[PDB]
Amino acid sequence: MQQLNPSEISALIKQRIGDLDTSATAKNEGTIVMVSDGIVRIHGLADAMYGEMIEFDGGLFGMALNLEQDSVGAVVLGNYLSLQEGQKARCTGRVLEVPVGPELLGRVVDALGNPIDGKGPIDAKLTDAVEKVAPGVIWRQSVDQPVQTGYKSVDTMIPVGRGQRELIIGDRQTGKTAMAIDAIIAQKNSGIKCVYVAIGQKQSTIANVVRKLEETGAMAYTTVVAAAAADPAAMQYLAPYSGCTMGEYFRDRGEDALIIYDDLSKQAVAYRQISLLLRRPPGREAYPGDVFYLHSRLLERASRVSAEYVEKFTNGAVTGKTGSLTALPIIETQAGDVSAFVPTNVISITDGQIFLETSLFNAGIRPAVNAGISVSRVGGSAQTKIIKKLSGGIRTALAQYRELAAFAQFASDLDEATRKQLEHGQRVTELMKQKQYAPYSIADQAVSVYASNEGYMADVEVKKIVDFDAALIAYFRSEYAPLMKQIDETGDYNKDIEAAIKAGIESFKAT
């Protein structure tokens, strides 16, 4: 035989003895049976839907997980210590909704549209179902539009287009969060949308970021959702989905946005905990096999779409606009665990990846970018013509340079070709550095890289070169202001423009 059904309860048995049918108002109200760790088995709700929110006499909510022949298993939404069986729960008929719209901007809120900032009860006009599928293929649109990082290295080697996906990855405190916030500040005139989700972080840390965005005025076109480590596991496991749903709103209005996924690794940990607590047989590293699906379901929703698709989403409300949505994931590795299971799965889905090296950060190179394993599958389609033309092989050349230098650590018989190659590689290396909160204009990188390709920098000091660049830009913005004005207004490279840049370069070298 086998174990008892967790639905055979002397009360229920006696009730069916009295009468079998008409159980619990045709199963509109459910009564709790089994309680452990935010996981609740409940008897008597067939009207209830899978994946439905579940109301409670405790005033709380529950998540529908297992619809079974005799009972239902669900996870608790919020603290569960205030519970016990024999209590009432019901099925809302709505399914996993959450407020969404413009009103969300500049608010600190729970993963359920609950104001955790205490700055007034947040209202809304629309809610929306959380779980959805990404649109069809005939509705996507090729990514072509710039996204700014204000970062020399990033913008140069790794273009980022609206609607693409690029992994940032490294070890603990390599400045991942820093990269993200830079990206956010890097959007203050783009008119694009941006929202931030954090997983399993210290409330103090969350407040730090909150206040930073405050003083930067970032709290004017952005919203934040918090999954602290104290938060119940399901809350964290669900929060990214809520963030996705909130973001898609604007892509559903033919507008672009960037959502910052922080600590997806911890999210995976939490979901694994959930699954194991459901007695789900594990695989490698105890993660259930659906983790790939887990993330993919989220990731694929953010992308660039066909204008007619949104025009279909609209009822003619929009005359045809390119809808898009970009995202930014964060994955944390354990001492160079680049071949680690979860990150490998992530890469399989992403359209781009960026990895940061620990020692170079400890060696002070910031951002410590491993140019080797750092790519953007779209390529040059994500940058202005200037960047397209000036760049094109620099990242590959740097990687080959570092390979040779690594091989030359026990070699001392270089020819002149390899010697100059290593010299130039070192040069380009120290080029690619900046300080925290140092947004570059595009013209900055433009003139800098042009000079670099023009040997005006192999002639100078490996140390002074950073001054050679700072003072160069200072000189140039001092003198040629309309030129950079124009080019950063357009991002256009013309031959006369190139001649003007050369004139500026020579005038600086003259000073």
Partner: protein, 463 residues
Amino acid sequence: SSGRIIQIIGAVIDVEFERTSVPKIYDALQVDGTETTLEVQQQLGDGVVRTIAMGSTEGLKRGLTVTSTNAPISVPVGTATLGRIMDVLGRPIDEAGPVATEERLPIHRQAPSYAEQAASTDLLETGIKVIDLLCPFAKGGKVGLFGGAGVGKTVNMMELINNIAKAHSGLSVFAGVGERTREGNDFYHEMKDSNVLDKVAMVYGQMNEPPGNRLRVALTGLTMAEYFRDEKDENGKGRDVLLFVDNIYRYTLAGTEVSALLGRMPSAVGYQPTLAEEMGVLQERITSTKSGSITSIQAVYVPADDLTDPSPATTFAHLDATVVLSRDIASSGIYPAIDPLDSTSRQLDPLVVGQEHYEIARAVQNVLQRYKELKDIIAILGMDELAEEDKLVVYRARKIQRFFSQPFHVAEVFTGAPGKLVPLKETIRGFKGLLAGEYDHIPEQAFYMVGGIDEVIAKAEKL
């Protein structure tokens, strides 16, 4: 008559039927309410049956009626499907209206008998130096691409399509299995820019859909191919078959997603113990028969770059040509990142490629092998501490590596340079000259991302 739900978990569902009529092991099931279809999985008995989902799992409530079709999944087949993009059920998604064919064929069938087995022994070039040297193809053979995450597998697929399918005359079928939609839209637009879009027929199952759809998707396309291979040419045997599959591993992953939910205990790893059987039934539906010839191209994801995970190993024994990518080599910047060592082809004997070709291949392979063993010592000692012949070996192998980098007409998006379609004669001449040491005075960079040996000399002089 009809049955109804008892329980819902993930993508696995149960239906209760009357003992008078219980569905056969594979049959299409119509949810009598919303728009969802079900596939029979097990004969749970006592009027109980277990099934998998073909759409979303939502709105479904325990007790909603559902009917059988007494027939498994049958999708439209024929030329009317070509130049079109249908779903896992054959329903159009290209907004080209219904397909104008009423021929229907099930997705399940038996493996071709041994008596009907045919053998392909006819070469097939690719214009790819490292492949055409180290991995020859037979028109209609089984060729697979092994590779980890992002190692450029997809790019190789497009390059091969460009350099084969266009030069090919006749129909062609490719399907992706759990893929990134962006590439799909791009690829479709690409053929639309071309005029071979008619010649191809197209199928998607992507990593955005319920796992049931993720599961039995390739079946449709391979069935398309079976039809075409078996379609007799007007007054002759059928035109050849161009087959292209993306991420076959995703099939096994889809099976994995539910394997536990079937009540099956875990295999040696979370994989399903059934693994080999559903692998083989897939694989054996790909051979070329007396009638028709099928050219199978398969990109295979490698989990954690573990070549010896159960799935890559088990898959591995079903291909004549082996092509694996190495993450570090790509990290070393070379494209393509094909390992010279592991990648093989059953067409490699002097009796097929010619004695000379076989000799040169053996020689260069042995050189690379030797260097690979030698590579460790220089990590400890200076390279000078080696014999002069050893230094020659090191330089020879390194320049060979440089020479393998071949620009491609698709990679220009990444960099901008045009591709190279090097004839095998130039390849073999250059390698004989290199292993003749005619160039032991040439900088290594003169070999990188170039075309023929003549281009190498031109580069060296430009140096």
